Amino acid sequence: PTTENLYFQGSMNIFEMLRIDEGLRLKIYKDCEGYYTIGIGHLLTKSPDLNAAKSELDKAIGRNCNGVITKDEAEKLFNQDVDAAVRGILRNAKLKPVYDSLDAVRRCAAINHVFQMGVTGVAGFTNVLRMLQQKRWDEAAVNLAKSRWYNQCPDRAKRVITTFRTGTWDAYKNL
């Protein structure tokens, strides 16, 4: 690796990782599962009603947005969603011990997964959680690849699954 590539490690963190997986959109749009979304993967509501989604948006941002936000507002909402995912792992008696056993880069993949799926969805993956705590990385990844989370929307999940396999940032390189 060049001095370049050894530096890529310090450029990557959970915010840059989720930013690649979720993208950045300043107007309400439907994600791959058809849920209204905005910003960096902020799911507004699972209602098919755009009006509900606009309502959730104005609550979340605190102004009359009419479906559109700024980059700064997107980043603020993103930071809030990241903190919620972390806090949801740390208070959960099933997820915390597994998270504590992980290295720094797989801990980012765990926060990413909870950001995407929510706590109860992730904590339900009993086999994946035990494989990870036992450092059975290849099996954990194969089992994540069976999930509906990955299969209904592979492009948003694939790099998280690669990161659980390898504990490196390689899947985020060379976009």
Ligand SMILES: O=Cc1cc(O)ccc1Br
């Ligand atoms: O915390 C979330 C999480 C998510 C996973 O897919 C595996 C392990 C953990 Br600890």
